[PDB]
Each structure stands twice: as C-alpha cells, then as structure tokens.
Swiss-Prot record, chain B:
GO biological process: acetylcholine catabolic process; acetylcholine catabolic process in synaptic cleft; acetylcholine receptor signaling pathway; amyloid precursor protein metabolic process; cell adhesion; negative regulation of synaptic transmission, cholinergic; nervous system development; osteoblast development
UniProtKB keywords: Blood group antigen, Cell membrane, Disulfide bond, Glycoprotein, GPI-anchor, Hydrolase, Lipoprotein, Membrane, Neurotransmitter degradation, Nucleus, Secreted, Serine esterase, Signal, Synapse
PROSITE patterns, alphabetized: CARBOXYLESTERASE_B_1, CARBOXYLESTERASE_B_2
Tissue spec. comment: Isoform H is highly expressed in erythrocytes.
Organism in which the protein naturally occurs: Homo sapiens (Human)
Catalytic residues of the enzyme: S201 (acyl-ester intermediate), E329 (charge relay system), H442 (charge relay system)
MF terms in GO: acetylcholine binding; acetylcholinesterase activity; amyloid-beta binding; cholinesterase activity; collagen binding; hydrolase activity; laminin binding; protein homodimerization activity
Annotated binding of galanthamine, by residue: W84, E200, S201, Y332
Main localization category: other
Name the record gives this protein: Acetylcholinesterase
Chain sites annotated for binding huprine W: G120, S201, W434, H442
Amino acid sequence: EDAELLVTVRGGRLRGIRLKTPGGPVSAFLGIPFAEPPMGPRRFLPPEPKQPWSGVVDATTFQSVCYQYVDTLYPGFEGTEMWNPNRELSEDCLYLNVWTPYPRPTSPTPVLVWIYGGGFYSGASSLDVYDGRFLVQAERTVLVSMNYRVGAFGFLALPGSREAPGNVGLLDQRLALQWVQENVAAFGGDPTSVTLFGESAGAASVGMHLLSPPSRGLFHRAVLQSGAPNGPWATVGMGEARRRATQLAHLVGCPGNDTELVACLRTRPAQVLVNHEWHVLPQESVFRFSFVPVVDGDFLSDTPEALINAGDFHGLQVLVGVVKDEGSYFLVYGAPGFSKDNESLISRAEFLAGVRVGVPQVSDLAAEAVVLHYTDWLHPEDPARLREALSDVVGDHNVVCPVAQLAGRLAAQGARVYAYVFEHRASTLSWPLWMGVPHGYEIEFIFGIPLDPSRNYTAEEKIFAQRLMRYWANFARTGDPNEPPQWPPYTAGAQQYVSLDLRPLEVRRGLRAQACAFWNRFLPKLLSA
Amino acid sequence: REDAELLVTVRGGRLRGIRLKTPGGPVSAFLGIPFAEPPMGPRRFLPPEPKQPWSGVVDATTFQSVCYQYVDTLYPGFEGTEMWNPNRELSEDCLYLNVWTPYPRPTSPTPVLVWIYGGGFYSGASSLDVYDGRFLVQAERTVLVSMNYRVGAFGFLALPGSREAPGNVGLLDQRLALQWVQENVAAFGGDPTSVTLFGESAGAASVGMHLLSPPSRGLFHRAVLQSGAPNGPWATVGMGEARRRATQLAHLVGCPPGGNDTELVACLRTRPAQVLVNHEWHVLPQESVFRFSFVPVVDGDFLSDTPEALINAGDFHGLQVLVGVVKDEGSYFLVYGAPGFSKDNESLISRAEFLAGVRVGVPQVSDLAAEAVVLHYTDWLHPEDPARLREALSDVVGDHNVVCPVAQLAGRLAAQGARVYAYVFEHRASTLSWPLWMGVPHGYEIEFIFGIPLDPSRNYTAEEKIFAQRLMRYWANFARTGDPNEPPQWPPYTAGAQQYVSLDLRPLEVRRGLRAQACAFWNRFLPKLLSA
Ligand SMILES: *[C@@H]1O[C@H](CO[C@@H]2O[C@@H](C)[C@@H](O)[C@@H](O)[C@@H]2O)[C@@H](O[C@@H]2O[C@H](CO)[C@@H](O)[C@H](O)[C@H]2NC(C)=O)[C@H](O)[C@H]1NC(C)=O
Ligand SMILES: *[C@@H]1O[C@H](CO[C@@H]2O[C@@H](C)[C@@H](O)[C@@H](O)[C@@H]2O)[C@@H](O[C@@H]2O[C@H](CO)[C@@H](O)[C@H](O)[C@H]2NC(C)=O)[C@H](O)[C@H]1NC(C)=O
Ligand SMILES: *[C@@H]1O[C@H](CO[C@@H]2O[C@@H](C)[C@@H](O)[C@@H](O)[C@@H]2O)[C@@H](O[C@@H]2O[C@H](CO)[C@@H](O)[C@H](O)[C@H]2NC(C)=O)[C@H](O)[C@H]1NC(C)=O
Ligand SMILES: *[P@](=O)(/N=C(\C)N(CC)CC)OCC
Ligand SMILES: CCO[P@@H](=O)/N=C(\C)N(CC)CC
C-alpha cells in the first residue's frame, strides 16, 4: 500500500496511481473532484466548491468528459478522432488531474496548468495528446489539467439573469486555479510559481484569465499557443449571446421570463442541447462557435481588445506562438472545394465563396478588401495559390493576427514576450501534405508524446520534443525559455520570433506583419465607417 | 527667287516655309501656320473658329507665340524646370500649328504623326526645344504635325451650360487642328488615312479624350499615350466643381462687381490675360500636388460620360494603341509641395512627413481612404525608414495619377478589342539635371522619342544616340503599321498576361504587370470604398 500515492487535500483523502514512462515512474492523481456536479438545478450556474468527503476518493483513472458535440466529418480518421471524447459524456465532469514526479517532491516545484482547446464547444483533459507523464518526468514539474464545461453548458448566457449568467466554463477554470492555490502543495507543487498554458480556445482562456483581475492572482506566467482572447471567435456581445440562447430554447421546444426560459432548458436532456448547438449561428461559417465567453462587464469588464490596449503589463512574461498553417485544418469543415482526400485545388469562384465563409458577418466592402489583399493580381486564378491564400485568410484573421496584436501590445506595455512559429510536420501526421503544419499539431511535441516507444516518431523527433519541453519548462521556472543560439524577446518594433523545427533556432522578423496590419489596423476603421 | 519645296497651298491660301538642317540632311518645316481665328477679346473662352482664307503668301518660318500661361519659378534658371517654360512671348493669339516634312517633298502619301504637348492643361507649347520634329522626320521619313492649344482658364474655364464659356475649348483647338490635318496634310505629302496621335502627360490624356469622343475619332487611326490617361484623377472635373472654380476666379478678379453667366464672362473678358493667370492657382479646393485648376469638364458634350465609364463600356476593335510610363512617375511632382522634399537634398522624409504627403498627393479623399493608402504603401517591418518612405510616397503619387490610370486604360482597351503595346522607360539620361534620387522622372523619355540626342550641339553619349534611333523606329513602326516590331520581339499587352517591355540601353526585356498589386488597389478596391 504505497504512501507516495496517498494524498490528503482540503476536501479529504485521495489515492493515485504510479505510471510508467521511458524515463522512469510518475505519480498521477486523475479525476479529482474540485466542484459539486453541475447537474439539474445547477446547470448553467457558476461552479460550487466540492464539499468535503469521508473515506478515500479513487483518483486512478480519468473521469467523464463534459457533454459536447462529437465530430463525424471523417469517422475513424486519426486526424479527427484524436480530438473526440475518449471517456463517457456527462454533466458530472468537473474533475482535474495532477501529475507529479515519483517519489512525490519534498520541496516546492514549479506548477504547469493546462487548459485544453476545442472552440469552447469541445475538449477534455483525458485526451492522449495531453498526457502529462512525459513533461513531469523529463522536466521535474507538477502538471495540473482540469475539465471545464463547454458548449451551452459552459457558455449559454442570458446576460443580467441569475439563472444563466454566462462564462461559467471560465469560472470552472478559475475554481480549478483556486484549487491549485489551496491544494497543490500537498503534491509537492509550488503555488507561488504557477504557469498557465493552453492551445486554441485554451489559449484564449489563458488570455482571459490574464485580463480578469480575480484570476490574475492565481498564476504568475502564461503561455498562449495558437489562440488569443481578442480573436474574432473567442467572445460574443451581450445582445448576440441573448439571441443565440433564445434561439436554442426555440429549437428544443422551450418558450417571457429568463427564469421560465432557463427552467425549461433545464428539463431537456444534455444531448438534446448538443444536437441543436450549431444551428444558432447567424451565418454559414468556419471558425465560429455558438456559445463562447460573453463580454458583460463582469468576468470581462470590457472587450479583450480594449483591455489589452489599456493594461499595464510590467512584470508579466508570456510565451506565444502559432503553427505554420493555422488556417488549413478549418477549411475542410465548410470551405467550398476543400477536402482532406484531394488536393483542394480550388477555383477563383470557390475562393471568393470561401472568403465569405471564412470571414463571416462582415460587409461586402470588407470582404472586397480581403480579396484585394490576398489576391496575387499577376496570378489571380491559380488554384494552388488560391488554396494557400484562403488558408492564409482564415489563419491570419482568426489566429495569427490576434496573437500578433496581443504580443505587440503586451510588449509595448511592459511585458516580456517570447514568440515562436512551429514549423515541423510530424512524420506521423495523417492529414494530407497540402495542409502543411496544421492547427493543434505542436501539442504532442510540447507534451513529449514522441517519447512514447509505442509510437512511430523518428529519433530526431524525440530530441526535438525534448528541446521543446525544456523551452516550456525553462519559461515556467524563470520566465525565459533560453538555456543559460538565443531566443530574443518579441517587441513591437523588431517583431522577432524563432522558428521551431528540427534545425536549430532561427530568428526572424514579423508575424505576418503586412497581412496583420490589414486585420489589426485598417479593417477596424473600415467596419466603423 | 523661290524654292518650290518651301511653297505649299492649303485651303486657306499659300504658305512659305523654311529648309532646316539636320545631321542626316535637310527637312522642310512650316512653323506657325494659323489654323484658327485669334481667340482674342470677344472670342476669349469661345470655341475656335476656322481661320478665314487669306491672299498672298503667309510666312510659316518660325514658331508662333505661346498661349498665355503660368510661368514656373520654383528653381529659377534651373535647366530641369526652364526646359518646360515658354520659349516665345505669351499671347492669346496663339492658335498655330507646325508641319515638318522631308526634303524633297514625299512622292507618295506618308504616315502622319501628330504631337499634343503636356503641361497639366495649364502650360506647354509646341515650340519647346524638346519637341523639335526635325529629327523624327529625317530619321523615319514621316510627316510630323504639332499644334498649340489654349491652356489654363483660356482653354478650360467652364461655366457649364453657358454659351459664352462652355469649356473644353482647348480640346476643340486640338480637334480643329486635327480637322486641318485631314483637309491639308496631303499638300505636304502626308497621308490623311494614316494619322497617329501621340502626346505625353496632359497631352496623353488629351489623346485619350479624342479616342473617347466620336467627332474626334474619325480624324485619326492610331494613338500613343505616354505617361498619361484621360481617366487620371487630375485630367477631368465635374460640372459643378468646374463652375465653382470659374466662379471663384471671377470673384477673385472682381467679377461681378456669380449671377448671370453672360455678364460674368463679359466681365472676365475685360481683365488682362496676366491678371487671370496670376489668380489661377487660388481656386483649387485643397493644398495639393498633381492637381490643376482648369481641366477638361465632363458635361455630356465632348465627353458624353466620364472617361472611366467610356473606357469600360467602349468597343475598341480595329484600334491599335501604344502606352507606357517612365520608371519614376511620382518623383518630379514631390518637390512642388510634398513636405520635406527638394531637388537640392536627399528628401529623406520622416514618417510624419510621409503621412502628410499622402494627403497632399491624394487630395480630396476621406480619412478612411487615406488610411487605406497608408496601409498599402507602408512596409510594416520598416515603417519609419526615411529612404523607403521617400520611395513609397513617390509610388503613391505616381501610381495614383499616372501608372494605374494607364494600366486600367491598357487593360480595358485590350480586353475590348484593341491591340495594345505597353512599355516602361527606364533610362536616366546622362544629361539629366535633376538629382539622382528622382530616378527617371516624368517627361524625360520625350527627348529620346524626338531624337534630340542627335543634335550636334548636345553632349549625349553615343549609346544614347543609338538608343534614340531605336525608339524613333519603334514609334514610327507603330505609326506606319500599328506594330512597333520590325517587318527581340515586343508582345502585345493583354489583361491576363499584362506583358510590357523595358526601354533602356539594354535590349528589350519582357515583363509582367504594370504595378499590378498597387493598381488593383487604385483601380478595383478604392472606387468601391468611395461609394460607401
Ligand atoms: C475535392 O473534394 C471536394 C469534396 O467532395 C467530397 O469529397 C470528394 C473526395 C468526393 O468524394 C466528393 O464526391 C465528395 O462530395 C469536392 O467538392 C464537392 O464537389 C461536388 C461536385 O462533384 C459538389 O456537389 C459538392 O458540393 C462539393 N463539396 C464541397 C464541400 O465543395 C471537390 O470538387 C473535389 N475537387 C476535385 C474533385 O478536384
Ligand atoms: C443675362 O444677361 C444677358 C445680357 O443682358 C444684356 O446686358 C446687360 C448689360 C443689360 O444691358 C441688359 O439690358 C442686356 O439685355 C441677357 O441676354 C440678353 O437678353 C435680352 C432679352 O432676351 C436680349 O434682347 C439680348 O440680346 C441678350 N443679350 C445677349 C445675349 O448678349 C440674358 O437674358 C440674361 N439672363 C438672365 C437675366 O437670366
Ligand atoms: C530638404 O529641403 C527642404 C526644403 O527646404 C529648402 O531647401 C533646402 C535645400 C534648404 O535650402 C532650405 O533652407 C530651404 O528652405 C527642407 O524642408 C524645409 O525646412 C524648412 C526649415 O528647415 C522649413 O521652413 C520649410 O517649410 C521646409 N519645406 C518643406 C517643403 O518641407 C528639408 O528640411 C530638407 N531636408 C533636410 C535638410 O534634411
Ligand atoms: P481551437 O479550440 N482547437 C482546435 C480546433 N483543436 C483541434 C485541432 C485543438 C483542440 O480552435 C478553435 C479556436
Ligand atoms: C499632368 C501633369 O503632368 P503632364 O502635364 N507634363 C508635365 C508635368 N511635363 C513637365 C515634366 C511635361 C510637359
């Protein structure tokens, strides 16, 4: 009966499991309840702290995945199934996981806290690609990851109402961060050295905790991978949030009091809400999600973009970056002429049609400005160039330029910023070659998944993964990824970043500076007049 | 006695010319042929009336007066500016034309080249040294004609709808000269069935307007547009703005002491010509470069619609045109008002001066339009580099006013049935007096087209004399056949391939795109922005 796997937290006693890695054992505590189950009357409500328990909670296996849409675009395809739930769906899903070295550390060790992505409509801390055992063994850190409510269950908002205030999925994350502050020392973690990191909507979540004062005291450093809180998909206004919530109620046979409305929604099975989730969007689109954080003055006192411009970020260190081809993944989900199973050599007409889908809810004039900038007017109809251009449109608008704006504003306002572009295409990648390095496929290297012997990564890849784990952990420990070729900080003027691939670090200038000047500087002025 | 080669009878009466010496042999020149009644006194602002017949022999032996115009004083005594200033006395009695013909007179009908000078519709003269037609005629055996036309208020002041000052009379001066060519050029040996118009800057815009005006279209067969287009943002003005500028000029000179148009023009006609010139520039609505007070007006008569509309909607089958630009169209105009610019220093401007220059180089556009210009012409990896900013503002002014209007005209004509040839002139003359940073400025291909390097009193290199002879051959080949190529090839310009040739001391090099990325902004996007 192993004392290393027995831990007492404030709520009671836990029993963990000893996990094997190629580098030696790891202690894991999986499925720790940090909130009361948000069931029945608690649906749509802020999380409530988990009440204490007697006896020993079995923390030896992942708990349920929060209720979410399950992707069916390519059934059985590894490229999509790796993101789908690998545990049963349940609204009883507010659990977190702790990985720690074996034996448990006696002195405080820096803590890494992972927030998964998935467009605020999906995701789980139990996915194979988020396995924390390799990072913990290799870099001697404590790693924490939590489940948080997604879709309507986490972000349906009737603003001003108590029954459905919105942003409760963000409050799930905050409660887990508060849990870390109060309990991580029992596992050997240092609550005074907590580094948030997340990808896609998880990166947008990290940025929103940066911009919400009640969350700012719960961590010390931040890593934003391929996502930003100022992304055009990451927040929604109060009026549009109310419209989407009201439209969902109509679609599921629900009725006008906000109270009556939510009460009827609470009688519906969770799967029924999921089945109508995508139908409340105003337009046919890619890279848009129905229920996302709402700007209502509470969690976010203003839009993330306003909060970024007006903040004093002295004393903050951030690590941000993007993959080489942020836009390609999303094109197969609705852009005309695109598929993972052919070359997606689109025509000019399909390109123009894709622009309206990839840049939804903008005026015709705004769309024409997009076409002007992303057309090569010496080769206006070349299919290969059009395919690459539409990928750039979607990737720049939704990921690269929001990340570039956040990096530049934080750096100019006192933060130390390190920026990267991930440019290695995994030898095991199942997506076609034309997609390049797609969104989300740096994660497996950050987590050291290539070190798993049962996988088919090359020897060079394993060394690459170990390099990236060292950068990320160096940043967690010191706020500086460099090993004491150097990685210089990103600044609004020099705009320096490094490329991450099998070659040594290469310093370059500009995160798509010409393109992002369009999205970040001109287009806001066009839309306002 | 008399040299029969220098005696010609036209419809108005008899003329006596002069024999000119050229390095290649003699040429007959008839300079100062009256083609209209002098538009003086009551005839000021009125359409030209044909010159009434005369008895005896008119001596057409020297250039006549320059039409009344502003005289540039930016760099007094400087060759780069003085070469464009009048070289004859100013007078409203200025409606004369010139004919150069080979000596002896041609035996069979010879193709005719007709030159229309530029000068922003406010200046210019057919008598400038750089327009000397003796070298083209001797080298290529063509007949060359050039005319004076009224400029400034005298040629383009418009009170639209008014009978006393209808506007566009300077264009009617050009048309009357073209009608004179049809009726009389055969007496000099010229072929009235093979007439090629060519002009530069506002002369090129004038050529394009004759292409788009049916009464002029029957008077010529081919066109050459050098560094100018009728669809340039400076080349035409609306009816209301023309009336506002004309009314403001009258107000500035004490007329009336608006109101009745007849009375208004009658008061203007009592003012000395120099008094009108002295107030010409004060009627512009905004501080700017590349904008001129009195230009052709779109009033439904000479131009039934805007040139852009007429170009987009026209059928141009059976037409051959040659168009082109110099390498640095914008640089010349920057020293005339862009902050931080001068011919006497490097003009390495700051970011603030660049932003200020954009409003001067793109006048009368909304703040949003100006922001679009700044977005496009800023290198956001080097947003404050002075050298890059200087080059960028030159591109802004050159693309907006010359390159992109020419590219739009070239693309639409080619797509709608015309045979188009396009060039970029990239040779900086060894004799150029402008600073090195200005590159190949606007207007400095003309001396090579006219073969000026062949003048023995000039100091051009031997390569430049060979170069000049190449260009004269291209232009005359086009005049004779509609194809500059010899009976390295010059391919036609098309809306898709967008092929043009570089003209310099090296052989022809074929390239693609007349600043396609930049001109997509000016020609395709910016119009949509201004309408919303
Ligand atoms: C590339 O594929 C897309 C997607 O089509 C699907 O996948 C293909 C592998 C094939 O099995 C198709 O039959 C599938 O529908 C093609 O775009 C579709 O084209 C059809 C016309 O044949 C049209 O009815 C659909 O609406 C199109 N779908 C989308 C999303 O645009 C595309 O034509 C293929 N490119 C080729 C073949 O060059
Ligand atoms: C605008 O004024 C003209 C000119 O009026 C003439 O000149 C003034 C100085 C004054 O002496 C008037 O008495 C003159 O008549 C008008 O054109 C004249 O119209 C009359 C009547 O139809 C005619 O007999 C004259 O020949 C015209 N003179 C011309 C054409 O030179 C014109 O009608 C006025 N328009 C208005 C007031 O709208
Ligand atoms: C480059 O020259 C301009 C023009 O100034 C004139 O020309 C210069 C060559 C020199 O002879 C000056 O004395 C002339 O006044 C400079 O811009 C001017 O700067 C002065 C004061 O420095 C100001 O009063 C004028 O308004 C400016 N004019 C314009 C059009 O901006 C410019 O500063 C010079 N650049 C240098 C020296 O780097
Ligand atoms: P992100 O939330 N993340 C996505 C789509 N992902 C699958 C590749 C990683 C979990 O994108 C929407 C912002
Ligand atoms: C539209 C303004 O440009 P154009 O009229 N021509 C110019 C300025 N010159 C002087 C270099 C040639 C006569």
